[PDB]
């Protein structure tokens, strides 16, 4: 599991709600969260699956 994976969504500056999905330890799961659309981090998947293969 990347460093990454550890590292709180964020949203970005931008101002579209694009649902995307990070994984919080806590819960051991992916889960969404809004993006605004640019300036991504890692921590930052187009699906559950996508999340769950990478930090899963």
Request: proline share 7%.
């Amino acid at each position: 599991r990347p460093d990454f994976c550890l590292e709180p969504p964020y949203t970005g500056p931008c101002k579209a709600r694009i649902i995307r999905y990070f994984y919080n330890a806590k819960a051991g799961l992916c889960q969404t969260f809004v993006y605004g659309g640019c300036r991504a981090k890692r921590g930052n998947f187009k699906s559950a699956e996508d999340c769950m293969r990478t930090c899963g």
